[PDB]
């Protein structure tokens, strides 16, 4: 494993802890302005029963953050153990946990959301996403599960584990978009074996459909082993209760059958800005 | 979109899903062609809602690799399966104790604790399955305490096919071969040289022995997998368990011999441990 100067992370001072594979730790200096304050940071490293893959693909995230940007809506790396010892990829703390867990969180009957709270969630994402697609770099694995919230309530793009740049991709090649979650990964990605950042937006579709349901699980009752074949035959969720008529018009925008054809996560940041402003 | 296997496939409507042990407890009634009415605890594997492809097509493989191996003592068996108009259901032999990783530091001295005699039999039980696996021209590649069940008699029965393979079926050479195998079990020339025989089975084989034989310990406890191979191929082995006679230490780091033919083979195994075991009960 090279030597990154610019990343690395003296051992010494990283405190690993409780478990969150993923753990909360105290990183001691981790700010390169706060020398001697203890940042409490979230470290992520190999399984005792890792694999080469796993390996491989923990490599691969971190190398995928260090050229990701920095960016309000997307976890950010605060940096990494490469040398002489396990490999650890230390990356910002969300305190709140992820966003499926924290919506299912305040189901109404812990302090239930607004409609407000789900457009400015649902903003905010698109915004991280927008970001990221203008770094050429695509997601493959968005969903709620994978959104981690910030003390703040901040949305934070996380888990990057399946992301590449744009170009890093094995066009047409079977085995080709073969760990993506189904249930939100967009047709062509199979079909063509191919992904695009409008392969995100169909995904982030998705993940809007569950904002809106605070965390409802997608195409309920339908086992992903029927799902493509629906799909192709046309079908697309229903309208979630507690979802305007336009923003669900957006979800179905974000589900067009021809990728050309589904919004851009330019053109959702805008959709979205406006619908926020207006509900304020 | 699967073909339709009429001796395999079992009557949706005759299965019960339950609680989960994705794997999950069933009652499937009348799948015993010589009990066409009673009720029998099953085991279902199916795909979770967050599944992709590649799990699917794993799922397919795992219950074709069942299909294969013959019926045998100290193997999980295929009791059926629903493949045809809803999800994916592989029906499994169920077994009540669980798997031998938490069956083991389960019964840790302070369940029942385990006698020196019960360990070894637990070995020699699971070197006839390898044994019997390998007569049958397959691979288990994930030997591991974890991959084993215990039924209610305490009768090993080695499960999870998933990477299992026929002995031809394997990309010798291929820099991706062999890429998902827990590497604390891995045989180094699983990695080093992209293949995979019955003599890696072995080198894994001694990992379960000692995971065996400290109750459930976790293998190379305190390195990375990071850096285990480069210790291995520096000469680093496991130490003796405590609790663990000599013969059986040697035994294991005889499976770790860097010469996958250096190794003993299954055969060989089972008969050395038949004879540690039958000289213990005397």
Redesign the interface.
Request: charged share 30%; glycine share 6%.
């Given at each position: 494993l090279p030597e990154d100067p610019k990343w690395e992370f003296p051992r010494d001072k990283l405190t690993l802890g409780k478990p969150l594979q993923v753990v909360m730790a105290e990183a001691v200096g981790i700010d390169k302005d706060k020398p001697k304050e203890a940042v409490t940071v979230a470290v992520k490293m190999?399984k005792?029963?890792?694999?080469?893959?796993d390996?491989?693909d923990l490599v691969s995230e971190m190398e995928m953050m260090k050229m990701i940007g920095k960016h309000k809506n997307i976890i950010n790396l605060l940096g990494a153990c490469t040398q002489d010892?396990?490999?650890y990829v230390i990356v910002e703390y969300a305190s709140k946990g992820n966003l499926r867990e924290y919506l299912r969180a305040r189901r109404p009957p812990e302090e239930q959301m607004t409609f407000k709270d789900l457009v400015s969630c649902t903003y905010q994402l698109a915004r991280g996403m927008e970001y990221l697609a203008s770094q050429k770099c695509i997601h493959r694995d968005l969903?709620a599960?994978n959104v981690l919230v910030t003390e703040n309530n901040v949305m934070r793009i996380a888990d990057f584990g399946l992301a590449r740049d744009i170009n890093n991709i094995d066009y047409y090649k079977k085995t080709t978009?073969?760990?993506?979650?189904?249930?939100?990964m967009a047709p062509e990605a199979?079909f063509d074996r191919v992904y695009t950042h409008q392969s995100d937006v169909w995904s982030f579709g998705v993940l809007m459909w569950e904002i809106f349901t605070l965390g409802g699980?997608?195409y309920p009752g339908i086992?992903?082993?029927?799902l493509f074949k629906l799909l192709k035959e046309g079908h697309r969720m229903d309208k979630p209760a507690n979802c305007t008529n336009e923003l669900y018009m957006m979800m179905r925008d974000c589900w067009h059958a021809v990728p050309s054809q589904r919004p851009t996560f330019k053109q959702l940041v805008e959709d979205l800005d406006r619908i926020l402003t207006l509900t304020t």
């Open positions: 190999l005792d029963d890792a694999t080469e893959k390996l491989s010892g396990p490999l969903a599960r978009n073969g760990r993506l979650p189904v249930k939100w199979l699980s997608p086992p992903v082993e029927e």
